[PDB]
Amino acid sequence: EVKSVKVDNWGVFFLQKLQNFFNKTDYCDLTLQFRDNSQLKVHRLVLSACTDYFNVLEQTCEIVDDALIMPNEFQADVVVPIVNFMYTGTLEFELKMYGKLLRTAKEMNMTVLLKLLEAHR
Amino acid sequence: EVKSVKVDNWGVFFLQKLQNFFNKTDYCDLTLQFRDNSQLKVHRLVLSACTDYFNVLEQTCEIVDDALIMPNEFQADVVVPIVNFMYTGTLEFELKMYGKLLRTAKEMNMTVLLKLLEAHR
């Protein structure tokens, strides 16, 4: 018969490995480019777990030298904290950015982040 | 100052999404081909969290029509349960395959699976 054995807390194991890959830019397959020409390299599948907005950007925005040109309303001030949230489950932000991050999560329909920003008690 | 808020159990959230992608072959970037010409589509980054063996296969094995030709000793009988383990943390196997799976994890140096197959009490 079929047996099964398991490693507990697989999600924690896997996230640690994935975060390391992100930090070292290993296996990244999407390069985001900001107005100042700086870049952030990411994993498409990580972004896609939370949202389809990056899918729509890839369908509708210019690609220059293998980098996706981010829209004017979606620059590093919101992108960097949101991407770090997608890799970790933690959103780090200054309060002054709360409303901008909420409007950005609403534009993305990023439900999991909306729920977090709107959490209470 | 910098604030932080979090979604608990992010690993569990993320794994559910990743497993769905695997089941639907969304964002897959590596196609494994068996001797019988059947294929298994996977995510390179998931495989890489557990092992570098697939990295070495990509460096050393033939690619035909966008698929990596698996070696004779590394066919679906061991590959399918090992890949499912990489996505889930659970290894499902018939006892008759225990030694073959252990020898395969040793060839791959897949430490996390070695530890599981060798676990006690």
UniProtKB/Swiss-Prot annotation, chains A, B:
Q: In which tissues is it expressed?
A: Expressed in spermatids but not in mature spermatozoa. Localizes within the spermatids to a sheath of microtubules around the nucleus and to microtubules within the tail.
Q: Which domain of life is it from?
A: Eukaryota
Compartmental location = Nucleus; Cytoplasm, Cytoskeleton; Cytoplasm, Cytoskeleton, Microtubule organizing center, Centrosome; Chromosome
Please give the annotated consequence of changing residue 18 to E: Reduces microtubule association and protein solubility, possibly by disrupting the dimerization interface
Positions of the BTB domain: 28-95
As for what it does, the entry says: Plays a central role in chromatin domain organization and boundary function through recruitment by a range of insulator DNA-binding proteins, including ZIPIC, pita, CTCF, su(Hw), cliff and others. Together with pita and CTCF cooperatively binds to and regulates the activity of the Miscadastral pigmentation (MCP) insulator. Cooperatively recruited to the front-ultraabdominal (Fub) boundary by pita, su(Hw) and cliff. Recruitment of Cp190 together with Chro/chromator induces chromatin decondensation.
How is the quaternary structure described?
Homodimerizes via the N-terminal BTB domain. Component of the gypsy chromatin insulator complex, composed of Cp190, mod(mdg4) and su(Hw). The gypsy chromatin insulator complex interacts with Topors via mod(mdg4) and su(Hw). Interacts with Cp60. Interacts with inv. Interacts with Nup98. Interacts (via BTB domain) with pita (via region between the ZAD domain and the first zinc finger domain); the interaction is direct. Interacts with ZIPIC (via region between the ZAD domain and the first zinc finger domain); the interaction is direct.
Q: What name appears for this protein in its UniProt entry?
A: Centrosome-associated zinc finger protein Cp190
Identify the taxonomic lineage of the organism of origin.
Answer: Eukaryota, Metazoa, Ecdysozoa, Arthropoda, Hexapoda
Q: Which residues of the full protein are shown?
A: 3 to 123 of 1096
